[PDB]
Design a protein around this ligand. Sequence first.
Ligand code: MGD
Ligand code: MGD
Ligand code: SF4
Ligand code: 6MO
Length: 715
Amino acid sequence: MKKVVTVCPYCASGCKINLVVDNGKIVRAEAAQGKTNQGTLCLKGYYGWDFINDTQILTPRLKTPMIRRQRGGKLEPVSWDEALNYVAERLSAIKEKYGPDAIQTTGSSRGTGNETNYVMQKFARAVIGTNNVDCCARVXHGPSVAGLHQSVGNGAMSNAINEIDNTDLVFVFGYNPADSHPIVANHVINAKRNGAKIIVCDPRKIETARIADMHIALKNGSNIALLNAMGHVIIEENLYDKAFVASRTEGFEEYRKIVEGYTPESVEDITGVSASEIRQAARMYAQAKSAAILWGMGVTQFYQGVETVRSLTSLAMLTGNLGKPHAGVNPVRGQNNVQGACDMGALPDTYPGYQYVKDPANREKFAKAWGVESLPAHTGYRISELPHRAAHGEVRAAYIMGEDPLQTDAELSAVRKAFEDLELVIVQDIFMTKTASAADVILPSTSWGEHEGVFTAADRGFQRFFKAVEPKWDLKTDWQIISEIATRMGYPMHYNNTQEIWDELRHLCPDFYGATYEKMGELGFIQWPCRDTSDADQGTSYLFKEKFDTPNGLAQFFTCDWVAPIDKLTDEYPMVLSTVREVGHYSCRSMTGNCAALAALADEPGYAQINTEDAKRLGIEDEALVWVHSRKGKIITRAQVSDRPNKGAIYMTYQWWIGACNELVTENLSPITKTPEYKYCAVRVEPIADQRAAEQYVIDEYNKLKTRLREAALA
Ligand SMILES: Nc1nc2c(c(=O)[nH]1)N[C@H]1C(S)=C(S)[C@@H](COP(=O)(O)OP(=O)(O)OC[C@H]3O[C@@H](n4cnc5c(=O)[nH]c(N)nc54)[C@H](O)[C@@H]3O)O[C@H]1N2
Ligand SMILES: Nc1nc2c(c(=O)[nH]1)N[C@H]1C(S)=C(S)[C@@H](COP(=O)(O)OP(=O)(O)OC[C@H]3O[C@@H](n4cnc5c(=O)[nH]c(N)nc54)[C@H](O)[C@@H]3O)O[C@H]1N2
Ligand code: SF4
Ligand SMILES: [Mo+6]
């Protein structure tokens, strides 16, 4: 009986786990003394691992490669040779006839590891010759990286997860650490315990708010209004950091102008917050010796989101909360390895190490190394534009790996036609998802406990994860599949193991070089940059200690005028749908939903958080099936009246296959990072009298999808 160390595949907290293996099976999971979690885990880390064993509760695991030779249907099993030559043939064919950019590839922020995201970008650029490589950063914190890239020169958490415990104030903004990153929540609570203050800015009364000294329930979509007003106060009352501002910032004056206007009072109605709170909050934040900003999707998933990120970073600039421990700007990245995939270059504009393709010197390096003459220099397509490129015949095949767009992408009807407008669609997954079911050719890969590599925690902290078991089927690691297709396409590629990839990588990314496998070890947490292999170089805890990484070393101050989200609350739909996530269930719910204990706390269709006071005047009560209509759709869900959602808005998540909230969301791709406005959707809740008939609708509709997906996997 033994224990195999791993990192949790759910959130980016980067919790270290000891998976007890007995015989040839995973038996139990238990917290390990990792750097972030230190012996603790949450329900998911603890219970969410039996999906490796093909429970088939939700979807049967992918066992054989498959091909759908006729669009009319029928996804029949096929051998590796047949699948692998089919892809290699098809891609090569399409590449010749229409150029390398006619192909779009995606990396994966889940169980694969950093090694394979690296391999994926490598194949797109060296084999296909395209920069068309992107990942969910696109739909998550893509805005965060941009805004931050410009403001301060780097898009990662400025400071570490383990630094929170010593801030003097934890400014939580549009982010629920309590349900999203429980171990990050536990670091927040620690700070409070140690006497730090806490401010939560969210319309809803989220768990976090209870321990908050100040809860600032800003009206959905009024972020910049509230922000400029805080900046207004900080300057008005001379609470800002003059020396810091003068010595390390650029653009103060121009920022000063736009906030002068936004007085606390002029904001009252838009923010729905009183001039006083705004004053006391800005006053509070600016007064902390060290104050840290933790933010998330309440910021990014709004088209005016790069501006909000830029705006927040401004406050921190203005207060000198950068360049020092227990402070900074912290966009807590979401998925276990989304941070990683980015580090690997699963972005359509950067090689791993954040060495952009535009730079000629980088291309010379990478091309030489990959033994290629030219690596493309123009930015690739972003996966969020797929439906648009696809429709235009700009893209003709997609190599979708480790993702479930047909359930997670905004405006799912759009992605379906997208899948219908592409010549070839290849899905590389571990489960028969809605996305895999609508594929031309499916290729299965080894799941988390069946392979190894490295993952990057929310705060750029490298960590190693180990193989615990063997796949019960003839599966390849994601990098072995891509390597074989590359080879079949004429470019030789084969890796004996993941470290081999990690070393090639380390030799091309001067900031990851010192993060050797030996160094990361079993419980090591090595946040890049880590340049020297020297064990004295344990990694970088916080950024911008000496300079700001901007072209000229100064942070760049910034704001703009508030602008309301797209749709408009009418008299019929004064209801604001703000999609979020739930605990116990993670994203796709492909892994989580196939886990016995987690499945047992929540199944279809999902819940819609409806406000107490106003629900009583809507004709909807707790546990009742209700309808949600929209320009994009009309979804069915179970209500849950309570005093938590803010009167006027409702809340739904994207983890449900039946009441797929994304069915209703219109993609209001931000003009900058091309990110959907998943946080604001004008909807109309409608009661349902014949509940009993609705209760069988959810069942029948669920059963249909479950058998559907099942026949495709097991036929
Ligand atoms: N249990 C569980 N955990 C997860 C996930 C999951 O699926 N399940 N997903 C993971 C991933 S991929 C990510 S990116 C993270 C995301 O985790 P979070 O960043 O917490 O994201 P959300 O919960 O979507 O939204 C955060 C908050 O923004 C608030 N908000 C809405 N409108 C506004 C507004 O106008 N202003 C402000 N200030 N706030 C607003 C919402 O009410 C919500 O409480 O969670 C990760 N962790
Ligand atoms: N309404 C609404 N929609 C949203 C959001 C929202 O807030 N509201 N949030 C958005 C955000 S921030 C995100 S992160 C997305 C999540 O976006 P998704 O792309 O849905 O992410 P997952 O659901 O984790 O998908 C992971 C896929 O990879 C598979 N997989 C796991 N391990 C491996 C592996 O080793 N190899 C391979 N090949 N496959 C593997 C899983 O089975 C699953 O099919 O949702 C977005 N959509
Ligand atoms: S889901 Fe997150 S907080 Fe929970 S055990 Fe995993 S990494 Fe840690
Ligand atoms: Mo995310």
